[model samples]
Target: GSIKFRVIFKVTVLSEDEVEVVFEVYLGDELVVKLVNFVTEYVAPAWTRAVPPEVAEALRKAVIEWGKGVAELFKKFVKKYGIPYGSVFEIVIGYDAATDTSFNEILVDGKPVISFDGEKFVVNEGAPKEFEPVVEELNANKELIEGLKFFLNVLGPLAARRLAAAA
Candidate 1:
């Protein structure tokens, strides 16, 4: 039997520097991954009619790639969010498969070895690692961070206005 699936990853910003990561894997006719940071989470668009099993599996793999990209993207996110230095960072990885779901342990240099066992996610089981500050080239380079705040502040409202005008 075939199943639909979706993967949603979320990281909660505990403070200026601390973060908690969570991943959700949902199985269904269609595979999907919902992504979110501390500020807001990505919502999955409405699902349509049924899809093929093979298509669903292909999409599930794609979702994994998407998750990897998301992990990489967070490096930038922390910087843009102005996460402070030396803050504890937490991460969660979750997946929902039509079959049994599994996640491997993640290695953090200088920090304790950590792993997620289906029901429970662990961090810093051993020694604590020195917190590394997110790289913010923007601080030195205006071309990077400049107008970023403006873009951040305006895009949503602008989209809303456009939607309202259409309505």
Candidate 2:
């Protein structure tokens, strides 16, 4: 089963051809999703549970509209490339740095695991929940490399264009 975690949005233009979108989920400053513009940046925007219902509803409506705008562009690309139309993405979750082994531990059992160092939540070694040696070795396979190429292709153009517009 997959895991679900909360996220925050941080807009960044990495380069002329790369827009880096990251979501900061935890209250402290650790980025969860670091997606580039070419990819669908899946970080949900800011929200508040204590707000009035009417205000919350309005916020949801606005967020939905923005999501639609973002989705439309990718939809256009998928049709153009004749690619399979399934969404692919990843997320980062905030782990308690004091008690958690490492930031990567959250992937184990697909649960949000929290660990921390002495002072603050630190994303050091011993944190990745599942550290598979085979998986690491297979990363060099041709097929996996091709997938990365495709990812960069889509992400590069979009990020560049967006950065130009922002400038």
Candidate 3:
């Protein structure tokens, strides 16, 4: 309903290394939209064993790396389109530990354009034709799109907690 919306981001530590990155858009006091990105901290639901330190460390690094990729991609995406304002354009990438795979999903407003279920991407008919390949591009390089994202994703939350505790 507004020409411009406020974006607020937070990478919150759920517990130890498990973190949640939330990007919320607001118009006045109303929330326009938001996407909460997180990696399910389960090796499998049947096996509820908590990740050990070594695995936890690796997972933490992975999340941070993916966080960096999102920032980099957002810059490139906005630079190319200069922010498409007719509708809300959002791209969400997540790791599903239960499936041991990564998935990327893109949406316009509330309708999904590209939906990836960690196996294949289905382009919902009627979305911009150009949006289909963007999914392929995201799929081709799992880490490049995934790689640039996590350092700050993890860092932002860690820094806040660190300072809050330090103070």
C-alpha root-mean-square deviation, each candidate: 15.4, 16.3, 14.0
Over 4-106, each residue of candidate 1 has an lDDT whose tens digit, in order, gives 3333344444544445555543334433334333222433332212333464455445444543443444455556655444333343322223233433333
Runs in model 1 with CA error above 4 Å? Answer: 1-8, 12-51, 79-81, 84-167
Worst lDDT run of 10 residues, candidate 3, spans 41-50
Query: Which candidate number would show the highest TM-score if scored against the true structure?
Result: 3
lDDT of 2 by residue, 1-167 (tens): 11222333332322332333333333224222233433435332322222345744553444344333334433433444332333222223223323322222222123233222222222335545332332233233444334333323332222223222332
For model 2, how many clashes?
17
Model 2 worst lDDT window (10 residues)? 100-109
Residue 50, candidate 1: alpha-carbon lDDT: 33
Give the whole-model CA lDDT for all candidates, comma-separated: 0.37, 0.32, 0.44
Q: Could you tell me the TM-score of candidate 2?
A: 0.27
| Candidate 3 deviant stretches above 4 angstroms | 1-49, 85-108, 117-122, 140-167
Local error of candidate 2 at 14, Å? Answer: 30
